[PDB]
Amino acid sequence: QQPGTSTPEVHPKLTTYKCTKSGGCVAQDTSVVLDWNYRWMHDKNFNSCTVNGGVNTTLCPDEATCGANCFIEGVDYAASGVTVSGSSLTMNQYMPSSSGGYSSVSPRLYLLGSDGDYELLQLNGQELSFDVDLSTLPCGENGALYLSEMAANGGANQYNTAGANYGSGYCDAQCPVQTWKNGTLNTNHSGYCCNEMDILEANSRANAFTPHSCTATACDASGCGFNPYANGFQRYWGPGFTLDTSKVFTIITQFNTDNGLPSGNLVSITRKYRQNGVDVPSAQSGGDTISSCPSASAYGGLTTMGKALANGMVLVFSIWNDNGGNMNWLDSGNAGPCSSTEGNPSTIVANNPGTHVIFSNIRWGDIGSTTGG
């Protein structure tokens, strides 16, 4: 909980822009930081403080004790699957193993600001657009760009001076019990819930954008997702399809409010695509929009999402697969064209190692002001 001196932590800078209707786009000095749990933490004598996703009780009985004795280290970002250049960020599901195979480095990054706190994105009544390359992501792979209402300082406190510069304080709508819940040891082994907007969870075969609203207590773990295949338009998204996933494309997510201003109440989430210089038509007539969100209705639904988006959330980038489900909920069944088995990590690392997602040209701001005439 003090920054280690062995591996200096240098955050790779990723060029992002905030855009106004009248003032145009202004560049931000944003970087990316890899998640807390991916890091090695040790003693002053190089005895580790972590052991198997759980602290080493000999060294962290206390949180005061653990603040004093422990030092969390920097990261080889290229080794971790992360490579960055200009506005572009490439994330690799796998990296070569010295022992001959492929290690499954599964990066989770956050958008960090100049001050060393997370760059909070206020998106109620606002839009966020980026370009993506998911051509090399097959079934069962999750290239993900989302937001979470995590603390901007990552939860840093008197006993944790590392904080967001080391990816501290992750939370999501699945309320995960982290070994450090918001910057401090989870002695209680509690779960950390917070509102989570998923802009993209996708591969070249299927995709979904999901809002998950939360009370302070709990979350709508499975939100009111929007998958075009699952809504009937099965040959809309895919290689060669209306939106060609084999080439780069542009994703615009628009958070529409009743009064038109960030001050208002969130009433819809509209998704628009552009590729090959042209607006790609919506799957459903009159727009790919989320108005109704029944699942969230026990959590003040879709309105509380707008309040968290208005407060400002943390930008998260990720790529992963699950050994349990094969991501079948995303790309299989009536949600996509993949087999129940096809999505299994075994088949992936065999057939598509170095499957990777490329996020680029992230911009956010006034609606209509982030895309280009």
Ligand X SMILES: *[C@@H]1O[C@H](CO)[C@@H](O[C@@H]2O[C@H](CO)[C@@H](O[C@@H]3O[C@H](CO)[C@@H](O)[C@H](O)[C@@H]3O)[C@H](O)[C@H]2NC(C)=O)[C@H](O)[C@H]1NC(C)=O
Sites of contact with ligand X (CB under 6 A): 43, 47, 51, 56, 58-59
63 in active site: no
Bridge partners, residue 105, by sequence:
none
177 touches which of ligand NAG, ligand X, none (CB within 5 to 8 A by kind)? none
In the complex, minimum distance from the CB of residue 2 to ligand X, in angstroms, rounded to a whole number: 16
In the complex, minimum distance from the CB of residue 60 to ligand X, in angstroms, rounded to a whole number: 9
In the complex, minimum distance from the CB of residue 3 to ligand NAG, in angstroms, rounded to a whole number: 17
182 touches which of ligand X, ligand NAG, none (CB within 5 to 8 A by kind)? ligand NAG
Give the whole-angstrom CA distance, residue 244 versus residue 232. Answer: 18
Of the candidates 202, 87, 81, the one whose C-alpha atom is nearest the C-alpha of residue 136 is: 202
Nearest residue (CB) to ligand X, 46 versus 334: 46
74 touches which of ligand NAG, ligand X, none (CB within 5 to 8 A by kind)? none
In the complex, minimum distance from the CB of residue 311 to ligand NAG, in angstroms, rounded to a whole number: 11
| Contact (Cβ atoms closer than 8 angstroms) between residue 238 and residue 245 | yes
Which residue has tokens 């995303």?
330
| Contact (Cβ atoms closer than 8 angstroms) between residue 59 and residue 49 | yes
In the complex, minimum distance from the CB of residue 214 to ligand X, in angstroms, rounded to a whole number: 36
258 touches which of ligand NAG, ligand X, none (CB within 5 to 8 A by kind)? none
| Contact (Cβ atoms closer than 8 angstroms) between residue 316 and residue 91 | no
List, as one string, the DSSP characters of 213-257: -B-SS-B-SS---B-TTTTT-TTSEETTSSEETTS-EEEEEEEEE
Which residue has tokens 């542009």?
250
51 touches which of ligand X, ligand NAG, none (CB within 5 to 8 A by kind)? ligand X
Nearest residue (CB) to ligand NAG, 94 versus 166: 166
First-to-last C-alpha distance (Å) of the chain: 47
155 touches which of ligand X, ligand NAG, none (CB within 5 to 8 A by kind)? ligand NAG
Bridge partners, residue 266, by sequence:
257
Nearest residue (CB) to ligand NAG, 155 versus 238: 155
Give the whole-angstrom CA distance, residue 109 versus residue 170. Answer: 10
The residue of the chain with the least Cβ separation from ligand X equals 47
DSSP state of 281: P
Q: H-type helices in the chain, by residue range?
A: 63-69, 303-311, 328-331, 345-351
List, as one string, the DSSP characters of 116-137: SSB-EE--TT-EEEEEEE-TT-
Nearest residue (CB) to ligand X, 65 versus 174: 65
Nearest residue (CB) to ligand X, 69 versus 250: 69
Which residue ranges make up the site for ligand NAG (CB under 6 A)?
A: 151, 155, 157, 169, 182-183
In the complex, minimum distance from the CB of residue 36 to ligand X, in angstroms, rounded to a whole number: 19
Give the whole-angstrom CA distance, residue 158 versus residue 62. Answer: 13
Nearest residue (CB) to ligand NAG, 293 versus 313: 313
47 touches which of ligand NAG, ligand X, none (CB within 5 to 8 A by kind)? ligand X
In the complex, minimum distance from the CB of residue 71 to ligand X, in angstroms, rounded to a whole number: 12
201 in active site: yes
Q: H-type helices in 62-191, by residue range?
A: 63-69
Nearest residue (CB) to ligand NAG, 187 versus 334: 187
Of the candidates 295, 308, 301, 229, the one whose C-alpha atom is nearest the C-alpha of residue 262 is: 308
Catalytic residues, which ones?
196, 201
